[PDB]
């Protein structure tokens, strides 16, 4: 009885994802595979300088790149929040819980969506107008040369699952509606929404990837993996916090990170 409604839920989520996220995975992969009829490639210091206007004061390069990643993350947080608000039931949750879910969920979604922009050799930046090589990012002085490499490692494995935007819309919704975040006041309505989202995700994967038998189980495991990526990311931010003193942190990120893990 619920299958037709689970498809309407899937469609609603896809439509909402298209409204929320300017650069989709479909569009990103067309750029990455060279099948549009343009991105400026940044692969060393000279190309970085040249490309800066296609994509801060006079801080060192590693810090300026890190600052840029911060403003992009802030924009992503806003897009993700708009998307969360279109998940049926989410705006009716206690506002404290909406904040908690985003606080602890938005980095897992950022890494998910970053994989759509990545291949094994680099990452699209500035809504697809630039492409920064993985080797270039690895060449930055420590510890900045290490920030992105776990995300690339994650992305290559995750992209091998060949999810599309419709699949990702539901996957991201499931992660946001996690009833085990610390400090949630009312877990039951969250788990009730997430159970429906999980059924919608299983049906979506069986219909859209009928040859891929245990794809649902593989995605559940990717949810666990994302939590470890975000743990490793906070650890690195601690190393930075100490060693590096030229580090302003955008207020929105300050708010998210405060008492985060």
């Amino acid at each position: 009885p619920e299958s037709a409604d689970l498809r309407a839920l899937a469609k609603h989520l896809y439509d909402s994802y298209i409204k929320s996220f300017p650069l989709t995975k479909a569009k990103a992969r067309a750029i990455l595979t060279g099948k549009t009829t343009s991105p400026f490639v940044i692969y060393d210091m000279n190309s970085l300088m040249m490309g800066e206007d296609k994509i801060e004061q006079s801080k060192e390069v590693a810090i300026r790149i890190f600052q840029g990643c911060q403003f992009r993350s802030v924009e992503a947080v806003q897009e993700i929040t708009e998307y969360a608000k279109s998940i049926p039931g989410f705006v009716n949750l206690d506002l404290n819980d909406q904040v908690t879910l985003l606080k602890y969920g938005v980095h897992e979604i950022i890494y998910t969506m970053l994989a759509s922009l990545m291949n094994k050799d680099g990452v699209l930046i500035s809504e697809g107008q630039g492409f920064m090589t993985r080797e270039f990012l690895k060449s930055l002085r420590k510890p900045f040369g290490d920030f992105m490499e776990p995300k690339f490692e994650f992305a290559v494995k995750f992209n091998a699952l060949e999810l599309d935007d419709s699949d990702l819309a539901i996957f991201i919704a499931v992660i946001i509606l996690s009833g085990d975040r610390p400090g949630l006041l009312n877990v039951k309505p969250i788990e009730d929404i997430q159970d429906n989202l999980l059924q919608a995700l299983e049906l979506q994967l069986k219909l859209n990837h009928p040859e891929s038998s245990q794809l649902f189980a593989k995605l559940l495991q990717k949810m666990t993996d994302l939590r470890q990526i975000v743990t490793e990311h906070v650890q690195l931010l601690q190393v930075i916090k100490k060693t590096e003193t030229d580090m302003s942190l955008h207020p929105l990120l300050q708010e998210i990170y405060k008492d985060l893990y």
Binding site: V77, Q78, T81, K85, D94, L95, N96, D97, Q98, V99, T100, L102, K103, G183, P251, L252, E255, I256, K258, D259
Partner: peptide, 17 residues
């Protein structure tokens, strides 16, 4: 609410229409 009070900016984004 204690989370609400500690997250002024996330609250504003959530409230927005």
């Amino acid at each position: 609410n204690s989370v609400x009070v500690r997250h002024x900016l996330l609250t504003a984004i959530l409230x927005g229409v």
